[PDB]
């Protein structure tokens with residue numbers, strides 16, 4: 001086995017070689033959502049509950065969200081419009097079985113097309129979705145839809161949540177770097193088909209989710225040692241970390257039950273995240289001798305307007321750092337795990353079109369944060385690519 | 388940066404430094420299961436169905452199984468004894484929220500005790516279970532029960548199934564080898580609380596499972612560069628592969644629904660596996676100049692007696708090869724993902740008590756096979772350690 005381990009692994013940093021995104025072709029305007037939502041769920045007369053919802057939507061800083069669920073589909077699925085008075089899991093599982101792999105496929109083809117290499121070269125697949133209805137998981141169905149080789153090594157990431165956009169990058173880094181020639185297809189596909197439900201005055205937290213969550217899928221090609229003049233890297237995955245904020249189990253959570261996926265959200269999420277964000281930064285960048293957070297490009301899971309404002313304030317980030325992040329939240333809302341990837345795409349695109357010296361708005365180092373159930377925080381250190 | 392990557396990764400092969408296992412306290416005798424099972428589910432009047440089940444149990448080559456579900460718990464949950472006449476998911480989720488982590492912690496504490504080092508050195512956790520009830524996944528709960536550091540990087544492997552015992556080793560290899568000093572706690576915790584239900588003439592493809600599935604949890608400590616005279620490896624994870632057998636989608640499957648997790652196993656599984664197992668061996672061992680399957684030690688997921696028989700005959704293995712495998716199936720039945728880890732533990736133990744020259748029955752190289760929904764086959768090439 002002399003030199004076997006050395007030849008088996010890769011040499012450089014895992015690099016994002018392409019980013020593709022997709023969304024259901026149904027843009028839903030936030031300005032008119034309160035009326036639509038309360039009408040379609042049969043709660044038009046509950047003015048006070050609708051006004052609380054209007055309030056939440058109006059302050060969400062989300063102009064629109066793409067949604068698989070349409071008035072037609074909801075009219076054919078009354079049970080999904082209820083809160084919890086009747087079961088709806090089975091019906092939702094059917095929707096997921098079709099929609100999650102579909103968006104995943106669409107986003108993956110875009111990433112594959114950009115990458116410009118044959119899909120026969122894809123060696124691994126990391127597939128993530130809040131939930132998956134059966135066994136095999138959706139990772140199997142997506143691979144089949146894409147016509148990937150049967151020997152592609154799959155890993156499904158389910159029920160992790162909104163922080164998984166970071167999780168999949170952390171996982172892809174080790175796969176790409178420890179396997180010479182490896183090319184990992186990374187996909188995050190999310191849809192509110194599993195969380196959408198009628199409003200309830202005794203569960204205002206669920207109400208907030210109904211105003212923030214949107215649908216979408218992201219796809220990446222990750223690999224180390226990109227081929228000169230053939231493959232093109234936009235970002236390098238340098239270092240990662242994951243940590244749980246102590247004593248915050250009920251801050252963000254969900255439950256898969258007969259009524260489908262229910263979620264819980266506490267108002268303290270903003271404080272909890274900002275109070276622990278500083279340490280994530282020091283632990284991540286001390287080794288790089290960086291202490292000025294404004295010298296980095298930023299990517300933050302847009303869990304909610306408040307979280308972003310609180311993080312921006314606590315760390316004294318100048319107004320431009322979260323522009324790409326807020327831009328995505330405004331145009332797509334909270335697409336869970338897929339969010340940070342759309343933001344990375346927005347970042348590199350804005351950099352090229354503004355004539356920046358790097359894919360990271362002219363800066364060398366950057367940080368990407370994923371937040372979710374735990375409360376869990378995923379930290380990803382990125383390095384941009386010269387333009 | 389180049390120096391950074393070199394320092395960031397580990398030097399040698401990912402090695403198994405400890406193996407721990409656990410099972411519910413209730414041992415269920417197979418010889419008397421038909422009467423108990425048909426009684427507790429109120430099917431004593433279905434004589435033909437009962438006789439069919441009896442023969443399945445009698446030919447299962449399974450002497451006993453440990454089960455979380457006792458007569459007392461089943462009496463307090465009649466919804467679980469039904470087939471699909473009434474929803475039972477919610478009741479099952481509650482059981483899982485309790486049992487999966489309980490078994491997980493027990494096995495993990497044992498492996499950690501064998502490892503002999505502080506749990507503060509555990510840097511990663513890979514946790515696997517057929518299903519998980521909420522978000523966070525069970526990986527979160529287990530980390531908490533074990534008192535792991537908040538910054539331990541977690542990866543939950545859900546709804547992969549019986550082949551996942553191989554999947555986690557494939558994942559642990561990259562995590563351990565690409566991270567210098569990394570010590571990965573790998574856990575598989577399975578329980579029939581989620582699959583147990585009454586027999587049904589209309590779903591015979593779901594009957595065999597009730598006779599074979601059992602409960603149990605396994606835990607391993609995987610790490611590269613074991614500290615001399617301190618840590619002790621019993622196996623090295625050399626090479627891995629995953630593939631899907633052509634047109635066998637419905638051969639092994641499951642669905643998470645309002646009635647709980649339903650499953651189906653086609654009679655063609657033994658044939659499918661044996662007709663593709665040869666190519667798996669060639670693709671895995673040709674590079675090591677090995678063509679004689681009998682010169683390797685073996686670990687095979689005991690999906691069922693027939694699978695083991697067909698594999699043995701197809702690869703013309705001598706009578707001794709599947710002994711450890713058949714021994715675990717006899718004493719524990721099919722514990723899904725955990726099986727191959729129990730078998731690995733049995734293999735090393737027997738080797739050291741029979742005076743063999745290595746932890747692999749005196750042989751240098753070995754293979755470990757995981758089978759499941761896909762139909763998927765995980766291949767893990769192992770190297771024993773001198774004794």
Ligand SMILES: O=C(O)C(=O)Cc1c[nH]c2ccccc12
Nearest residue numbers: 548549640641650690723758759
């Ligand atoms: O032994 C195998 O190959 C299986 O996948 C059997 C099995 C055990 N537990 C299950 C749960 C859902 C689907 C299949 C199984």
